Design a protein around this ligand. Structure first.
Ligand SMILES: [Ca+2]
Length: 152
């Protein structure tokens, strides 16, 4: 049982970097193994090029407010959709090398990706894009636990 909130920190239509911000909260009664959790951000690549993901900042915040920095545990991979839609031909898949999300805890992920030649994207044709001043509940990003959908 989890809740996913999301926004894009940089809303410019034309940009050389995309910055998905995720916050995932365990609203259930038992711990979740983060090594089994994946998150998807769907978009159109606007000219296929090699891409790279980095996490700017990620942390697991306990129910009491404890802080555990996990930035270097956050991995990103790019997956092509073999049948594209008008607003999705690729997703960034965010995964974790390890960690545990206790009941009432949340993990916040400040993601970033770019083409290796730093060429432009257009965000207006990206399914998952959400301009907001802060995290909002958003059902156009998805989450899977051990490959089983848990948000979306
Ligand atoms: Ca696009």
């Amino acid at each position: 049982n989890l809740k996913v909130e999301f926004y894009n920190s940089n809303p410019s239509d034309t940009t050389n970097s995309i910055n998905p911000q995720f916050k995932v909260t365990n609203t259930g009664s038992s711990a979740i193994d983060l090594s089994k959790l994946t998150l998807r951000y769907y978009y159109t690549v606007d000219g296929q090029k090699d891409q790279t993901f980095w996490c700017d900042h990620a942390a697991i915040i306990g129910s009491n407010g404890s802080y555990n920095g996990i930035t270097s545990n956050v991995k990103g991979t790019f997956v092509k959709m073999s049948s594209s839609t008008n607003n999705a031909d690729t997703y960034l898949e965010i995964s974790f090398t390890g960690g545990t999300l206790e009941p009432g805890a949340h993990v916040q992920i400040q993601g970033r990706f770019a083409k290796n030649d730093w060429s432009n994207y257009t965000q207006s044709n990206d399914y998952s894009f959400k301009s907001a001043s802060q995290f909002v509940e958003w059902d156009q990003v998805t989450a899977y636990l051990n490959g089983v959908l848990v948000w979306g």
